[PDB]
Design a protein around this ligand. Sequence first.
Ligand SMILES: [Cl-]
Length: 191
Amino acid sequence: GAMEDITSGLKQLDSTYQETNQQVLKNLDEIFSEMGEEDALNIATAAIALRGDLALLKANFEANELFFISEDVIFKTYMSSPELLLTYMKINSDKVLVLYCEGKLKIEATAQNIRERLETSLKAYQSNIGGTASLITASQTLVESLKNKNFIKGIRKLMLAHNKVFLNYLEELDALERSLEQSKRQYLQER
Ligand SMILES: [Cl-]
């Protein structure tokens, strides 16, 4: 649904990245065939950011997109309802209370894995976003600066969407814990 949107956002950003990188390497090849010197240095600096910090941004977005795939599998299956969670615990005081024990434990473990992923992603963005300044500094005209700034705004928008996705997982797990406890109460009441 909204994940086609995010996948697409990523493909667009990647395309702009490849083209920015192509343009920069072409420019370096031409340069190395005082205002011009400062510009050449700004461009080499951009080439470095593109290979380094910004490649790390790209890898981060990619790891997230893959995860959104596999974790989506998890949430559409054994994590999709209390009944199916309990069943999953069964295949892998009372004999059913313990099953709920296992289910709640699995929810907790899932939330923890999601938090660790989100933390890693937030850290990668925080550490690498600063490298985008160099694309602004290397711009030779206000038009080029505008295009680079749009690219950067796009990077931030994609990041805002990914954070929404992670937090949405956590919220779903919270609702599911509520429901699992309500179902557990209802079960005990019927036994
Ligand atoms: Cl949480």
